[PDB]
Write a protein that binds this ligand. Structure first.
Ligand SMILES: Cc1cc(NC(=O)c2cnn3cccnc23)n(-c2cccc(Cl)c2)n1
Length: 286
């Protein structure tokens, strides 16, 4: 539906996994009245990555929710995914730049919207596998959207988990234990990663407080490569956990820690997380 020749490059926005996203103007009348859109492409096209990308596109096309980035279409010559452009960029960058202006009530509004977008995903038996603030986008001051689905899988019909081990860089510092040890991904592992997203938000993305920096400090920074994952596994098994962020209330920390349960079946559901967060937001209005 979108023709290559009318897509004008404006800037690179970011890179992630094996994808790249650009700001472009789609201007088929060539009178500079077209809309700005976001365009996702493969950094390096292979046959493997293209088939994954096609599935990614079909996944996003299938999702319609206030807190999920909107699909607009595709562009063929090398496949490109065209999405709505959200002008405040990624939540990771936004939070960092505006920390002095974003309060806890606002972080909890973002948290609630993330939970609802995630509950909608589970409704379609989709496992996100990559929840992190870098993957959430800001539409305006009062609304975020889950903004990338690069690693998202559909559960098989007969199982509540999906086993996968991709080559490359895995975001191991957001992973549930059973994802690290067994390569199992489920709604419950997404709940684990949501807890890390919640941790991220309450750190306001202070660099020295990122999950990689805190876990690497807990493991020892002398560790390289293959030994990191092994020491991370042992840490989590021994109930090593990210600390409570500066300023975070106990009740918000308890949500995180409950998400970070080694027992996959004892982690809360996305519907219950939303309820609890919304109840805490309501208790801050009075
Ligand atoms: C620093 C950075 C900025 C962005 N994005 C955007 O500002 C953006 C705006 N509308 N929009 C739509 C869809 C996707 N992204 C956007 N990203 C990024 C986000 C997701 C995936 C990837 Cl690979 C990068 N990183």
């Amino acid at each position: 539906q979108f023709e290559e020749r009318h897509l004008k490059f404006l800037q690179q926005l970011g890179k992630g996994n094996f994808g790249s996203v650009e700001m472009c103007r789609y201007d088929p009348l060539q009178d500079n009245t077209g809309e700005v859109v976001a365009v996702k492409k493969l950094q390096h096209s292979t046959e493997e990555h293209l088939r994954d990308f096609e599935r990614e596109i079909e996944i996003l096309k299938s999702l319609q929710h206030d807190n999920i980035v909107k699909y607009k279409g595709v562009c063929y010559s090398n496949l490109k995914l065209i999405m709505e452009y959200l002008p405040y960029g990624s939540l990771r960058d936004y939070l960092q730049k505006h920390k002095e202006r974003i309060d806890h009530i606002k972080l909890l509004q973002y948290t609630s919207q993330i939970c609802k977008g995630m509950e909608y995903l589970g409704t379609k038996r989709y496992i996100h596998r990559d929840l992190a603030t870098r993957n959430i986008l800001v539409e305006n001051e009062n609304r975020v959207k889950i903004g990338d689905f690069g690693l998202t899988k559909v559960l098989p019909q007969d199982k509540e988990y999906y086993k996968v081990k991709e080559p490359g860089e895995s975001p191991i510092f957001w992973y549930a234990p059973e994802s690290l040890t067994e390569s199992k991904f489920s709604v419950a592992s997404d709940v684990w990663s949501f807890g890390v997203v919640l941790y991220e938000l309450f750190t306001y993305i202070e660099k020295s407080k990122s999950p990689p920096a805190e876990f690497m400090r807990m493991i020892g920074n002398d560790k390289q490569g293959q030994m990191i994952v092994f020491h991370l596994i042992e840490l989590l098994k021994n109930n090593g956990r990210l600390p409570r962020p500066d300023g975070c209330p106990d009740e918000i920390y308890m949500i995180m820690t409950e998400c970070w349960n080694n027992n996959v079946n004892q982690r809360p559901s996305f519907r219950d997380l939303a309820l609890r967060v919304d109840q805490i937001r309501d208790n801050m209005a009075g």
